[PDB]
Paper text:
Neuronal calcium sensor-1 (NCS-1) is the primordial member of the neuronal calcium sensor family of EF-hand Ca2+-binding proteins. It interacts with both the G-protein-coupled receptor (GPCR) dopamine D2 receptor (D2R), regulating its internalization and surface expression, and the cognate kinases GRK1 and GRK2.
The crystal structure of rat NCS-1 (hereafter referred to simply as NCS-1) includes four canonical EF- hand folds; the overall fold is similar to that adopted by human Ca2+/NCS-1 (27) and its yeast ortholog frequenin. Electron density consistent with three Ca2+ ions in EF2, EF3, and EF4 was observed; as expected for the NCS family of proteins, EF1 does not bind Ca2+ (5). EF1 and EF2 form the N-lobe and EF3 and EF4 the C-lobe; intra-lobe hydrophobic and hydrogen bond interactions help to stabilize the conformation of the two lobes. The crystal structure contained two copies of NCS-1 in the asymmetric unit, related by noncrystallographic 2-fold symmetry. However, analysis of rat NCS-1 by SEC MALLS shows that NCS-1 is monomeric in solution with an estimated molecular mass of 21,880 ± 200 daltons. Helix 10 forms one edge of the large ligand-binding hydrophobic crevice, rather than occupying the hydrophobic ligand-binding crevice. At first glance, the mobility of the C-terminal region observed in the NMR experiments appears to contradict the observation of a single conformational state in the crystal structure of the full-length protein, where this region forms a well defined helix at the edge of the hydrophobic crevice. However, it is likely that this conformation is one of many structures adopted by the C-terminal region in solution.
Residue numbers in the entry: 2 to 50, 60 to 131, 139 to 189
Amino acid sequence: GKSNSKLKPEVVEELTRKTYFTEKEVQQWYKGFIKDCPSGQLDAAGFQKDPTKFATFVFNVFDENKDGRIEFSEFIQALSVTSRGTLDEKLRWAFKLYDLDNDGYITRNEMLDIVDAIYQMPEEENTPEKRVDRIFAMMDKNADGKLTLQEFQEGSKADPSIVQALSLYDGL
Ligand SMILES: [Ca+2]
Ligand SMILES: [Ca+2]
Ligand SMILES: [Ca+2]
Ligand code: NA
């Protein structure tokens, strides 16, 4: 008598209120989620399914409570921010992605780890090192080798390409 094939009504209401989705959209996302992960808990191996490193970094941000599983509430809220969030919401989310040790700063090495993963997944951009050097030249204002949330927000907003990439809604 499986009890998690659909959401409880109160949870449909909760999740609709916490995201940019309609009730119908929340239920549609659950249908697909539970089909692909009947346990209701998506683990790192499942999320994975060369992209290994970057999928693992994204997995950790989806995993809000850090218990090694992405449950639906986590899945749908991450989808909400990354697909439909405002520019500032998406920037806060991206900062969490890059801040690997959750200390409130993105170091050069933290960023390098992410950018390498993206690459693993034009001469002046042909290494992760070059890409990071450029980002830090543009965003690190006190030259201490790390980005505060403010440095990352303001730095990102200065660059038209970054603004474009974070200003989409359902990919458009
Ligand atoms: Ca979790
Ligand atoms: Ca950090
Ligand atoms: Ca700095
Ligand atoms: Na600009």
